[PDB]
Amino acid sequence: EYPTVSEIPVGEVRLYQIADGVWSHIATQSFDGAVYPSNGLIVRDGDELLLIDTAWGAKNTAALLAEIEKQIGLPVTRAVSTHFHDDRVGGVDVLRAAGVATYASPSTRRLAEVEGNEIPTHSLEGLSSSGDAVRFGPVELFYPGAAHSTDNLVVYVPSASVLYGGCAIYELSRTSAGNVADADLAEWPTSIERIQQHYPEAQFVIPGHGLPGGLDLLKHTTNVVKAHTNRS
Ligand SMILES: [Zn+2]
Ligand SMILES: [Zn+2]
Ligand SMILES: [Zn+2]
């Protein structure tokens, strides 16, 4: 029942209930003559919502807020971007204009600034060293080390056992490495091991793009990263 680029007109967003008070958001974007899906997370925080990641652009992100307003009807008070690339911070101004507090690590804020990308307002302290975790309302934020990017974070919902891996985790259908221009291929498998060791109990694993699964998405990503590393 999980939405694919099949069920999603570009410019629109669908929500998907993963567990009680946890949803993913799914959007699509054209890039380089192909159409890709993109996932983020929505976590109920009492009577408000914490959003993880934009819906990859201003137009998509305005559709996301409208769709949250339609389908959940609770206010989005805070948002966290999991790394500095446009599919995660693109739309941060839309969030800001709607009165959402936008957050990212100083590492992410620095890299977005260098990249000329949108910059989340608020800074997340205590994530600068591999293996650091901090509590952020109904989730834990975890910096596993460099992987897809040097600043990538992952997000865990303790109450529902949902691990959101963002773009550091690939879906099973992904069989070759994506865009790795900003990746640390040498450290990626070690970073995934930190994730494995810290959340052995996760029941659902949501990748940055594509279908959810279980913890074998971690091993899958390792397999793919290692194959790419060994490319001839
Ligand atoms: Zn990225
Ligand atoms: Zn603020
Ligand atoms: Zn991504």
TrEMBL record:
Q: Where does Zn(2+) 2 bind?
A: D87, C167, H209
- Entry's Gene Ontology cellular component terms: periplasmic space
What SUPFAM superfamilies is this protein classified in?
A: Metallo-hydrolase/oxidoreductase
Name where it's found: Periplasm
Keywords from UniProt, A to Z, are: Antibiotic resistance, Hydrolase, Metal-binding, Periplasm, Signal, Zinc
Q: Does the keyword Signal apply?
A: yes
Q: Where is the Metallo-beta-lactamase domain?
A: 37-209
Annotated Zn(2+) 1 binding sites: H83, H85, D87, H148
Positions annotated to bind Zn(2+) 3: H122
Molecular function per GO: beta-lactamase activity; metal ion binding
The keyword Hydrolase belongs to this UniProt entry's keyword annotation: yes
A Pfam match is Lactamase_B
UniProt-annotated binding residues for Zn(2+) 4: H220
Family per record: Belongs to the metallo-beta-lactamase superfamily. Class-B beta-lactamase family.
Q: What does this protein do?
A: Class B beta-lactamase which confers resistance to the beta-lactam antibiotics, including penicillins, cephalosporins and carbapenems. Acts via hydrolysis of the beta-lactam ring. Has penicillin-, cephalosporin- and carbapenem-hydrolyzing activities.
* PANTHER family per record: ACYL-COENZYME A THIOESTERASE MBLAC2 (PTHR42951:SF4), METALLO-BETA-LACTAMASE DOMAIN-CONTAINING (PTHR42951)
Please give the name of this protein: beta-lactamase
